[PDB]
């Protein structure tokens, strides 16, 4: 039982780890989104 | 009223001169990438208000 | 019409005053006391 | 002469901005898919912990 | 059963969203951490 | 979630 709380403890912080890039990724996301509008409207002035 | 509209209408084309300037420069001056600083796009929204 | 005879390339559909001024400085004339007339802009063209 | 300068650097840099646009829709797909991965990953190590703690529970 | 699906979607995405904050918390920790090394080092060589 | 899922489980 104590192995296995051990094995538990170390599988949830590896998932912690995991979601921390998986958010990071989210926030670069976002930025990205963010910057990719930001391009099309400067496209489009740009165009003009 | 029609001097002082004359008077808007001359200061305006040259807000316009002023604007074909800036941007001019803006673009010319970076030597690099313009969708990386965001400065470029804060001139650019003040140059599209 | 001796450039033309010539075959001088010469561009017809352009003004005088607009070919040798500014609009800048052709603002800043009628500020400082000028007629509008297109003699008294060439003649402020000659003057600079 | 200048004014032609000016204006092939406004082209060139209308052409990079082109490029960008391209290379950062193609990055936005691949981080869309390199979260859903990861997503999927930590799905997948909940549903280790569920049996983690089944067996636990069990044993 | 699929109410308690519904709930351990909602549960894992609260749980998500708080593990974001915590690793955003751990983040300005870290800032936090260097910025009083690089301090502590400041106050030392300024002291003398 | 451990226990949402134990009570999953049974029901």
């Given at each position: 039982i104590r192995d296995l709380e051990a094995s538990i403890?170390?599988?949830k912080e590896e998932?912690?780890?995991?979601?921390?890039?998986?958010?990071?990724?989210?926030?670069?996301?976002?930025?990205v989104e963010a910057k990719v509008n930001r391009s099309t409207?400067?496209?489009?002035?740009?165009?003009? | 009223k029609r001097s002082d509209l004359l008077k808007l209408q001359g200061e305006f084309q040259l807000r316009?001169?002023?604007?074909?300037?800036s941007l001019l420069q803006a673009?010319?001056?970076?030597?690099?990438?313009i969708l990386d600083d965001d400065t470029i796009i804060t001139t650019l929204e003040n140059l599209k208000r | 019409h001796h450039l033309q005879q010539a075959n001088?390339?010469?561009?017809?559909?352009?003004?005088?005053?607009?070919y040798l001024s500014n609009a800048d400085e052709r603002l800043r004339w009628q500020a400082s006391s000028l007629p509008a007339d297109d003699l008294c802009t060439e003649n402020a063209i000659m003057l600079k | 002469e200048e004014q032609?300068?000016?204006?092939?650097?406004?082209?060139?840099?209308?052409k990079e901005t082109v490029d960008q646009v391209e290379e950062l829709?193609?990055?936005?797909?691949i981080k869309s898919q390199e979260l859903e991965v990861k997503n999927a990953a930590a799905n997948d190590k909940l549903k280790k912990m569920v049996k983690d703690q089944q067996e636990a529970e069990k044993k």
């Open positions: 403890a170390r599988y998932y912690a780890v995991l979601i921390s890039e998986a958010q990071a990724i989210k926030a670069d996301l976002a930025a409207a400067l496209l489009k002035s740009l165009s003009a | 316009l001169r002023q604007l074909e300037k673009l010319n001056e970076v030597k690099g990438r | 001088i390339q010469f561009r017809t559909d352009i003004a005088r005053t607009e | 032609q300068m000016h204006l092939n650097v406004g082209l060139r840099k209308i829709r193609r990055d936005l797909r």
